[PDB]
């Protein structure tokens, strides 16, 4: 659980755009917790960018 914090900036179906505390836009898996506008705690494991592949 490598937790990263980001604000749900936008949603792409099952993907979510998070504007992190770093000010970076990352594409993550959208969970049911993802509401547009809120800062969510996700894992790096949720990140579609930093998947590991």
From Swiss-Prot:
Q: The organism sits in which domain of life?
A: Bacteria
Q: Where in the cell is it found?
A: Cell membrane
Residues of the RsgI N-terminal anti-sigma domain: 4-51
Provide the membrane-side ranges marked Cytoplasmic in the record.
Answer: 2-53
The record's note on quaternary structure and interaction partners says: Interacts (via RsgI N-terminal anti-sigma domain) with SigI1.
> What's noted about domains in the record?
The CBM3 domain binds to cellulose.
Reported function: Anti-sigma factor for SigI1. Negatively regulates SigI1 activity through direct interaction. Binding of the polysaccharide substrate to the extracellular C-terminal sensing domain of RsgI1 may induce a conformational change in its N-terminal cytoplasmic region, leading to the release and activation of SigI1.
Q: What is the name of the protein in this document?
A: Anti-sigma-I factor RsgI1
The species this protein was found in: Acetivibrio thermocellus (strain ATCC 27405 / DSM 1237 / JCM 9322 / NBRC 103400 / NCIMB 10682 / NRRL B-4536 / VPI 7372) (Clostridium thermocellum)
Give the gene symbol.
rsgI1
């Amino acid at each position: 659980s490598m937790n990263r914090l980001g604000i749900i900036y936008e949603i792409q179906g099952m993907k979510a755009v998070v504007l992190t505390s770093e000010g970076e836009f990352l594409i993550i898996r959208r969970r049911k917790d993802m509401k547009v506008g809120q800062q969510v705690s996700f894992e790096n494991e949720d990140i579609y960018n930093v998947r590991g592949k």
